[PDB]
């Protein structure tokens, strides 16, 4: 397989990916980074949506 084919297969399985702890942690980190970017831009509307999404994704055990 080529590198591009590997990336395509990984994206396909990510679309198929229901949940994975490593991927959930990565998604939460990316969401936190996006939230701080929105905070620095004084966007009070996006930050509410990002906070709601973070609350929904979180609550681990």
């Amino acid at each position: 397989l080529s590198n591009d084919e590997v990336n395509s297969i990984v994206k396909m399985k990510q679309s198929l990916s229901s949940n994975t702890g490593f991927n959930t942690v990565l998604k939460k980190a990316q969401l936190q980074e996006e939230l701080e970017e929105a905070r620095d831009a004084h966007d009070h509307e996006r930050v509410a949506r990002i906070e709601a999404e973070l609350k929904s994704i979180g609550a681990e055990s």
């Binding site: 590198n3 591009d4 990336n7 990565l26 980190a29 990316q30 980074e33």
Partner: protein, 45 residues
Amino acid sequence: WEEPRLILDQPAQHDNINKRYEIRFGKIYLSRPTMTEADGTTHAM
């Protein structure tokens, strides 16, 4: 911002046209650390 201006000037006669070329430095934007692979894809590190 300690040195916020780079200035070049030129009195063109080649009609006296004094042209000043100046560039200013603005905000600083930082990001979270990121890894850029050889293939081209970038991801959080």
